[PDB]
Structures are given as structure tokens and as C-alpha cells.
Amino acid sequence: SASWKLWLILDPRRVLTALFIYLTVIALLIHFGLLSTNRLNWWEFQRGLP
């Protein structure tokens, strides 16, 4: 496989920074979105159940 030649053109530092920011944003969206739901909020006392 010649996939490694990607790093001759794609600048590993740019890719690492982009992945760092991108995955952080996704993880923050998921954690805080789950905390905005009654069903899947694991911090608060259980709400929204009869």
C-alpha cells in the first residue's frame, strides 16, 4: 500500500490539528446533547419517567 505517500502532500500537522478540533467538537456535541435529554442524562436525577 502506498497510502503513506499521503503525508508527502497532506501535511500531517494540519491533519492532526483538524482531527483534534473536529473530534472535540463532535464529542462535546454528543455529551452535552445527551445531557439535554430526560432519557439519557446520566448526571441529573432521573426525570421524565412516570
Partner 1 sequence: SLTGLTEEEAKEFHSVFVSSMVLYLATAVIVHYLVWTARPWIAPIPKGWV
Partner 2 sequence: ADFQTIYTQIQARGPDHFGPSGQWGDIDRVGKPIFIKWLGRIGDAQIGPVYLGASGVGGIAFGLTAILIIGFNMLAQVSFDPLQFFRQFFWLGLYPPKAQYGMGIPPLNDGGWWLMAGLMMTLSLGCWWIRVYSRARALGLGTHIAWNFAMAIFFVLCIGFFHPVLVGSWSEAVPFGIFPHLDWLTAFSMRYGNFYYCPWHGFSIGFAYGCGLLFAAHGATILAVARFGGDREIEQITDRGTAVERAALFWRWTMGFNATIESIHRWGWFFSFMVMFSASVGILLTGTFVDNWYLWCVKHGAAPDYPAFLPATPDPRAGTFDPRTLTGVPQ
Partner 3 sequence: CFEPPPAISTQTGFRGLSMGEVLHPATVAAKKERDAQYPPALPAVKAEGQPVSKVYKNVKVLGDLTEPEFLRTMTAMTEWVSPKEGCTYCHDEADLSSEAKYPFKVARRMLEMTRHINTDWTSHVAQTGVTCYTCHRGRPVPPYIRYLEPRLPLDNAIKPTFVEADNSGHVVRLAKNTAYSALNYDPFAMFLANDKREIRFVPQTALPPVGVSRGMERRPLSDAYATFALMMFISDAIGTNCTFCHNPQTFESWGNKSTPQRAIAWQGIKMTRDLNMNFLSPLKPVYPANRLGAQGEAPMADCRTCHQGVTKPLFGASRMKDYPELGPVKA
Positions at the binding site: 36
Q: Which residues make Cβ contacts (< 8 Å) with residue 49, sequence separation at least 6?
A: 38
- Residue 11 touches partner 1, criterion: CB under 8 A: yes
| Residue choice 3, 5, 32, 48 for contact with partner 2 (CB under 8 A) | 32
The three-state secondary structure class of 50 is coil
d(CA 18, CA 37): 29
- 12 touches, from partner 1, partner 2, partner 3, none (C-beta below 5 to 8 Å by class): partner 1
In whole angstroms, the minimum distance from the beta carbon of 11 to partner 2 comes to 15
